[PDB]
Symmetry: D2
Subunit: 285 residues, 4 copies
């Protein structure tokens, strides 16, 4: 049903700046692999098959991560590091293609999604903002829960997550009547950029996961700095839009402290390094 995802990765990484100066923000190492790997793993494990990277001329190392490397592999063979060569040879499954299109100028998220129009065609599709990592815990990731709701409802999905009341002026916040249960959706009437701590329509923050109809591309061509939130506003005119509330946990890597937070949480969960990483932390005192 939903087989395509747009990962808009053409930013210059002004946030996380020394680190992103000469490599993509997406290629920033989180424990032992680049951040992007975690976002592509999340997509693929919700049944995505076509990864559509909207990219910048400086971001070849992202495309190169999901391609084969002749010199690297023959180095790995010559040293008989055979289990490794097997790991770095199938980062994505056989049936998953990774596709590139260029955002010609940095004119925002709406413009980025519009750049993928030709590749999206008449299909319904997901958007993954890759500066945000989602950790699942439950065995079925939020993106998969949220796609199935989209399939069932044929209503656009905006992933949201409860934040503390006194920190709501940091977020895009959705207008809903009540808040849904975790892993459930409710109809939503709009989103408020950074509402004042007094005056937030809810405590439900936009995380940067979407399932949208193809309609959205003609909407983006007709938006009053082309803004996804008011292409979605325009979709409200003919369509239900629902807010899907995460069951899992987000990490904002675009921001140095939420990066350090992912390294700590993912590191401790590392199926191979977790326990040795725990010991390193305890030794700190």
């Amino acid at each position: 049903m939903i087989k395509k995802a747009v990962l808009p990765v053409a930013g210059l990484g002004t946030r996380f700046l020394p680190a992103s100066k000469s490599i993509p923000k997406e290629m920033v190492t989180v424990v032992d692999r680049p951040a992007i790997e975690y976002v592509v793993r999340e997509a693929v494990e919700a049944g995505i098959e076509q990864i559509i990277l909207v990219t910048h001329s400086s971001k070849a190392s992202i495309e190169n991560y999901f391609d084969r490397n002749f010199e690297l592999e023959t180095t790995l063979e010559q040293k008989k590091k055979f289990d490794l060569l097997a790991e770095i040879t199938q980062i994505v499954p056989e049936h998953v293609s990774v596709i590139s299109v260029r955002q010609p100028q940095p004119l925002g998220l709406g413009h980025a999604v519009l750049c993928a129009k030709s590749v999206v065609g008449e299909d319904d599709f997901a958007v993954l903002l890759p500066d945000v990592l989602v950790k699942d815990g439950s065995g079925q990731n939020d993106l998969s829960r949220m796609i199935s709701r989209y399939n069932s409802s044929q209503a656009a999905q905006i992933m949201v997550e409860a934040v503390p009341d006194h920190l709501v002026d940091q977020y895009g916040i959705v207008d809903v009547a009540q808040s849904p249960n975790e892993g459930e959706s409710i109809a939503m009437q709009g989103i408020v950029e950074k509402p004042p701590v007094g005056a937030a329509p809810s405590n439900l923050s936009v995380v940067g996961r979407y399932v949208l109809p193809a309609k959205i591309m003609q909407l983006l061509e007709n938006t009053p700095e082309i803004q996804l939130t008011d292409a979605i506003a325009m979709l409200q005119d003919t369509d239900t839009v629902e807010a899907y509330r995460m069951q899992g946990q987000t990490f904002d890597c675009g921001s140095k402290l939420g990066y350090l937070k992912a390294v700590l949480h993912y590191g401790l969960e590392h199926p191979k390094l977790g326990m040795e990483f725990k010991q390193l932390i305890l030794e700190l005192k």
Copy 2:
């Protein structure tokens, strides 16, 4: 007197592999900046003014990190963010120059040093292996102590650090009559690559920081595929070589666990994030 440092960075690094698949392992993120900035920093706080990168066709991003980035700088100016613009324009003092020579094939450390012959010319010179991060808490860095000693003694210096007895297996070990004290040098007859746990002439491992005379280049054109420890042996037949024993602490950023120890230790002491990071860790166990 010691103004040149050779940083051999041509290695692909199959050791921190997933992370360095598509970026140089020298560009791996350590809190908020690539690992290499900590080594170039080390060299500069010890009086170097010409960083010589002995590099690979896939390492452009290392050179670009020490160059100016036009679209990034302007994006940051016409988004009025000048604290960030400081962080990416003055990585090294205006008088520190970064030059690069290609190591055409991976023929070991000694081939890499010898690739720098046309740039070192008649000058004596430091060698820093950028996979090893050295942290000083003294305010005179181990490389500066080691350069003081070279200038005084005129004796070639090999930086070393005691390892547990059951791991001498893993390192070059210096052939030395007595352990020098932390901060001090003594004469050495040679190094032994991975002596068996039984048979080691010390517990002092070769760490990856050397001070060498220009004349090792001629030696390196004659070794018995070119090994620096052999050129150091040959030098022995004419000149005093000494083992400098470090006072600082090391992190092998080549190993997944030495890299995570660097992220913890360097992070805990970040000026800004230090306290917030410190707090993230407490919020865990």
Copy 3:
């Protein structure tokens, strides 16, 4: 009707070798622009809208040619070279997207076309081999003539061109009953690789222009070095395949002498340099 074209550009350019060593063969300059520009211009002027580059990790400069360049443009503004900035800003029209997918290993033309499966989907599509330039003369290019025949007939088209009898062992040659007129098609039963000068089924050579149905992708997944010619053989089982004979002229840039031949023919036709270029040639004696 036909809106998509696959340009398979992942070769390492073993032919035209010194020139292609460190830049794409596709980026080799023909008068005053890279060869690829001529192939993309030909596609767009036959109504192609989606350029699907099947590419290699070494071929970023091809994608960069059809993208915007921040530093280049601001250099061009600062020098008030305003007519130039306008030329290098719209190399392709507004409605044309350029898309990338990687050929993970160099396993031939059939495998290259198969790499674009996800992007081609259920659409019928053209294949342009970009080492071959076609010059039109007539005002309607052969690719457009050939697409319309495909539309009309719903029979796959293989572009061919009459070559001298005594040079037929240099070409893939089509099996047809008679030869069609220029700008016309006839049913074809197969293609013979480099038949002996005695024993060629015709004098009609495969040029490297195709219009194929989407079917072809499941055929390529089921080919006995995956070979397009025997995916087309397999299509013969359920479909007419026709040979469309050029009205225009080809130049094989993959081969140093056919490169020099394009530079001479395109150079003389240059709407701005043609006549001054003629004079330069006459001066040769």
Copy 4:
């Protein structure tokens, strides 16, 4: 004695613009090889052993051309094509080294030369502007004659070539009492950038080849945005500077017509293609 040559290659070259949009204008194809190989060739046939590239973040392909290409070499071996493999592995003699330093901003020729200060050290040095190709038919190249003269006279050398009287407008022109003969030098008081057609002190244009003493670097730190002709003036107040008048022929590869003249002249005399190319031209008019 003269063993270093500085090749300033950091310029974007908006002059041969379409062609150099996405590749360096130094990597532009001249018959079968990039333009730069003809200049590095010129330097090496005249006794240079350290090519110093003063380069830009977008020019990796220049350095890669003088380095080894692993996937290309092996692809060529396991496709048994060893004449081709010779053409890409021995571009420069084993003892010629290529090093690179970044010109951080485009502040003219004088800024570029001064970027090479840490590499030139105390050595005198040649400067070659790679947009100009010099062809010798004598068997001693103009740069070798000019280096002979420097060594003899100890006088700084500026290579020059007479231009028609109605174009002195377009060039730096040397202030000289009498024209030297082809192959010979005389004393010069200064250069005048684009004197009006009336007011020129000679018809001898500055061509873009200099031999300079180490001490121009100190001068370049003090010029009245840094202009080499000003540093040369300052040098005048202490040392004889001479104008060397060339015997060879020039091609401005920066101009679309000077580049096409290079393709004709160098092609006509290619060992192999020479005769075939010669014939292609006859088959035209």
